[PDB]
Every structure is written in C-alpha cells, then in structure tokens.
C-alpha cells in the first residue's frame, strides 16, 4: 500500500513497463540540418558540454566508450527526471534494471583490465609507495571491494531514487492529514515539500552523473 508506486505497472493485463522504458529516447529528436530548432540546439549543446566532461579525462582507448558513457548519462538523467511526474513509475527504482546497467558496464570494464593490460591492472591492488610487511591484509580490500563495486552502483542509484520518492510521498501524505487541521501549518509542511522537490530534481541529475562517473572512473583505471 506504501510501495505501490514501485510495483510493475500493468494496464488491461498488458505489461506497460515497456512503453515507459522506451519513452526517454523519444524526447531527444535529431536532425541532419545545420541550423535547427531550439530543442535540438539546446540538446546538442548539453551533449557537447557533457561529453567534454566525462570523456576529456580519458586516453585514446578510453575515448572509444564516448558513445556509451554519454548515451548512459542521457538515459539515466531522463529516466529519473521522468519519475518526478505525478504517479509516474520510474524504472530506476528497480533493482533489476539497475543491476542490468551496472554489471555489464562493470564486468566489461575489468575484463578489458584482465583480458588485456592485466599486468598493469595487477598494480592497482598494491599502491605505489607501499611497504610489504602487511600486504597479505591489503589484498582482501582491493579485491572484495572490486567484487562489490557492481553492487555499489546499482544500489547507490536504487536506494537514492526509491528513498527520494518515499520521502516525497510521505511528506505529501502529511500535508493531506494536516489539511483538515490547522491550515497555517499545512503551508509550512507544504513549503518543506517544495524544497524537497527542488532537491529531488537535483538528485535526479546528480544520481545520473555519479553513476556515469563511477563507470567512467572504473574505465579510466582499466584503459
């Protein structure tokens, strides 16, 4: 009854969760022209400013992912922002979807660190200026954290959009309860919901930039 906005949506027995995951790309029109409209002029600028941010820090092999790590910050920042609409089912609150964006991009990042350049990837586990006599303890950290980075991504994003929606939905129910009670209090609980919606707008973008930065930093440490 409380987690209702996270159950897979179905209308007329049809799994409507597919027309919701495939919609974000519909808000990004493209054109071959040279001078287009305001939408594609602002979007092609954001993609320019974004790609120059995540990708500048990479070498030539890391920059071959400049289509992936840009088409990923565009898909997470548009799925989150389409979740703040009323009653909307944002599929980034799903541990299934988030585990499907996290494991491949991570596994495909350490594999290229183990299928090639492996002898160099063996040197990140042991920092440069490290004395020896307590190495058999540090080996646990750099591996067990590596083995849990793919689950850090998918849960840092799941637990931040879920908890952001749960809070806005509870504080919302508060204003509904104090509506039939002292009303000058309703307006102070509501203005908390407004400052909270401006926060959930920012955390809708920040959680997209951090997800695609930590996938970038994993890549930078394997190319």
């Amino acid at each position: 009854n409380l987690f209702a906005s996270f159950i897979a949506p179905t209308i007329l027995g049809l799994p409507a969760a597919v027309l919701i995951i495939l919609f974000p790309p519909l808000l990004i029109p493209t054109s071959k022209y040279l001078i287009n409209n305001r939408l594609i002029t602002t979007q092609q600028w954001l993609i320019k400013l974004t790609s120059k941010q995540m990708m500048t820090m990479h070498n030539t092999k890391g920059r071959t992912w400049s289509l992936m790590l840009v088409s990923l910050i565009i898909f997470i920042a548009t799925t989150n922002l389409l979740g703040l609409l009323p009653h909307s089912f944002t599929p980034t609150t799903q541990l299934s979807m988030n585990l499907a964006m996290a494991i491949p991009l991570w596994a495909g990042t350490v594999i290229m660190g183990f299928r090639s350049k492996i002898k160099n990837a063996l040197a990140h586990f042991l920092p440069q200026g490290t004395p020896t006599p307590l190495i058999p303890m540090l080996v646990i950290i750099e591996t067990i954290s590596l083995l849990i980075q793919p689950m850090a991504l998918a849960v840092r994003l799941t637990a931040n959009i879920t908890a952001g929606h749960l809070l806005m939905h509870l504080i919302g129910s508060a204003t509904l309860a104090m509506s039939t009670i002292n009303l000058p209090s309703t307006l102070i609980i509501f203005t908390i919901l407004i400052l909270l919606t401006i926060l959930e707008i920012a955390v809708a973008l920040i959680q997209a930039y951090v997800f695609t930065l930590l996938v970038s930093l994993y890549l930078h440490d394997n190319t």
Binding site: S5, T42, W45, P86, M168, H169, L176, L193, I194, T197
Partner: protein, 105 residues
Amino acid sequence: PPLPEYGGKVRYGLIPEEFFQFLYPKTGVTGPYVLGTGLILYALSKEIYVISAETFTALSVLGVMVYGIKKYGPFVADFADKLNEQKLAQLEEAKQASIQHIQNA
C-alpha cells in the same frame, strides 16, 4: 526546406488553441473553460481522481515546473538563439573570407 517561425500557440502549456477555436462557435468564449471546471469537479466528486498523497506531490512538482519555466524560460529561450546566430555568423564570416583567399589569389 526552411523551418517555420512559430509553433501552435498553446494556452497554459497543456491545451492547444486548435481546441478553443473548435468549440468557440457553438458554445462561445467561456465554452471550453467551464468544461474544465465541469470535468474536474466531476472527477474528484465521483472519486475518479482520488485525492491521495500524490496530489500534494503533484502540485509541488507542477509548482516548481511552472516557476522554473517562468523564471528560467526567457534566459534559455534566447540562449538557444544566440547559439545559432553565432554559429550562423561564424559561417557567413569565414564564407566571405574564403573569397578573399580566392579573390586575391
């Protein structure tokens, strides 16, 4: 082909003007408006749109949206133009220069 210069003249960013003119003749100026209040008051009376916690999270994300549009609209409205009348001028300029490098030559 050249793009047009204006869109669809939509009122309240939700209902296009092709609707008001479509109902203006038979029902007049206040025709479509009273339909709105007629549907909303019917919706939330027969519990079609049931007031829930989402009602007050709707008004908030609609309040921030209608205020971000009114406060940051005109700034983005022209910034999208200046990116063009710069990229346009940046071409026409070099275009003329590219003649000097062939006129002098």
